[PDB]
Design a binder for this molecule. Structure first.
Ligand SMILES: Nc1ncnc2c1ncn2[C@@H]1O[C@H](COP(=O)(O)OP(=O)(O)NP(=O)(O)O)[C@@H](O)[C@H]1O
Ligand SMILES: Nc1ncnc2c1ncn2[C@@H]1O[C@H](COP(=O)(O)OP(=O)(O)NP(=O)(O)O)[C@@H](O)[C@H]1O
Ligand SMILES: N[C@@H](Cc1cccc(Cl)c1)C(=O)O
Ligand SMILES: N[C@@H](Cc1cccc(Cl)c1)C(=O)O
Ligand SMILES: [Mg+2]
Ligand SMILES: [Mg+2]
Ligand SMILES: [Mg+2]
Ligand SMILES: [Mg+2]
Lengths: 260, 260
């Protein structure tokens, strides 16, 4: 019989599309050599043909979707002033206050895109015609307990529209077109707040403004927006058992173990 | 006559393609209203047509170049173990040792891509045919003195080939094809080491292995590689006077002031 340590080793080499019975009679060394051969072949095929990383490719595909729908592509700082966290209403009572990676005395790694998106909406309202539609994709950081659905370093899509047309119906239409474009099953469950679920996994939280917090950011128009984790989208699309398979990582490439 | 503070204000609104004499007789309020009008028009045109961010677009264009040349696209952690810095030979004597953004007790924001690229070359050598060609584009972080050519948060392209064909000629051919593809003037000046210059501005440092440091990373094959700053490429291509115009930023969008 396989030890638990041996099954752990085989599980890192197992891909969802495999159809191998680990619990059958075959010895560990033979099961391991078979899986090593397939994963090496998987990497050789990627190298010979497409050569694109799942996380980079997903970001490029989402970028094309939102640019084509009239949203301006934003690239804003990842290292942000610590004051932005408090100004978001994240005080000691909230969970997120304990999840911040602090840097130096006055900076942190952003755990969210909302502060920079607020700042862009306010500034662009002086220049662009109504409605203002923006989006950003990039790294975000949170301290988390170990869990199959959370990374400490992940990638967030955030989009926001401000001005006319900021209805819940329009928000649900964006989400619906977006996930049907990507081929990801979902249910929307519900200022108004709204979560996008895949089974028990949260793909997104979405919001409809105005809300009282807007005033602190110099915002006084209605808005709709949502934030999606890219690694969670990849986990669902590729049926990964653990989100570590979709992360920026030295241990996995497109969900394939790099320890061969 | 304009005050220095007024000229500073006008300089943030001035774009390289403008042809306005600030030192002429026109009053500040009129020069400011003219420049505000043009920059608002510039943003409106981006929003109406392409809607792509210069830094995102450049990353996508570089990605296509290297994928098409047979390099595997890597996305590796930005928050890296602090031990990687020492293992790179960065001790107290080097400048880079004082430039590290530390996070928690044992992590830092990566100032370079070399450690993760080394780790990928070693792991992929067990799976991929010779030669192994990889590249990564993403955020890097260094503490810097104020200067028109440096950001504390920037974006690095790093590529590396390991195995056969790792000659200086082949390295110079990659660099030359790459920058002629982008339309960026350069001179290459010179294990062997090699810098890619635009006038007095360093676009890249490049290297040819083996070097003694490889052994610490489990590497024992020849290699060639180089690292390029994306914001410096944008600064040259768009003739920005200060690299702040090309950065991830809340103050500039595609080199256009957002404070209008
Ligand atoms: N640690 C994380 N790892 C991966 N994705 C994350 C992480 N935290 C948040 N996300 C994603 O970012 C989206 C928006 O962030 P947010 O609504 O603040 O998350 P959240 O409410 O903390 N979700 P959860 O922690 O799963 O209950 C989420 O719906 C997830 O898709
Ligand atoms: N602070 C920075 N801001 C922007 N680009 C940078 C920065 N540091 C390095 N780069 C870019 O990354 C490339 C490779 O890094 P590296 O060779 O370590 O830089 P460097 O030797 O410290 N250059 P410099 O600081 O200008 O003398 C450089 O050639 C630049 O294009
Ligand atoms: N609240 C998360 C996700 C998000 C982003 C943007 C907009 C909304 Cl409504 C939600 C963040 O600030 O990044
Ligand atoms: N030395 C810089 C630039 C670089 C990257 C990769 C390879 C070479 Cl030769 C040079 C870094 O480690 O990121
Ligand atoms: Mg959470
Ligand atoms: Mg949520
Ligand atoms: Mg330097
Ligand atoms: Mg250098």
């Amino acid at each position: 019989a396989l030890t638990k340590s041996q099954t752990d080793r085989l599980e890192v080499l197992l891909n969802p599309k495999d159809e191998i019975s680990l619990n059958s009679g075959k010895p560990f060394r033979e099961l391991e050599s078979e899986l090593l051969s397939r994963r090496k072949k998987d990497l050789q095929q990627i190298y010979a043909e497409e050569r694109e990383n799942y996380l980079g490719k997903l970001e490029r595909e989402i970028t094309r979707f939102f640019v084509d729908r009239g949203f301006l592509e934003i690239k804003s700082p990842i290292l942000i002033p610590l004051e932005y966290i408090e100004r978001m209403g994240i005080d000691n009572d909230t969970e997120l206050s304990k999840q911040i990676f602090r840097v130096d005395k006055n900076f942190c790694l952003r755990p969210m895109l909302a502060p920079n998106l607020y700042n862009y909406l306010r500034k662009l309202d002086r220049a662009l015609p109504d409605p203002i539609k923006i989006f950003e994709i990039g790294p975000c950081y949170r301290k988390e307990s170990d869990g199959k659905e959370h990374l400490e370093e992940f990638t967030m899509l955030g989009f926001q529209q401000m001005g006319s047309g900021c209805t819940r119906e329009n928000l649900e239409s964006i989400i619906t077109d977006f996930l049907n474009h990507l081929g990801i099953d979902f249910k929307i469950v519900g200022g108004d707040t709204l979560d996008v679920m895949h089974g028990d996994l949260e793909l997104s939280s979405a919001g409809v403004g105005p809300i009282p917090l807007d005033r602190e950011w110099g915002i006084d128009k209605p808005w709709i927006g949502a934030g999606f984790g890219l690694e969670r989208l990849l986990k669902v699309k590729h049926d990964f058992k653990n989100i570590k398979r979709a992360a920026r990582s030295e241990s996995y490439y497109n969900g394939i173990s790099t320890n061969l």
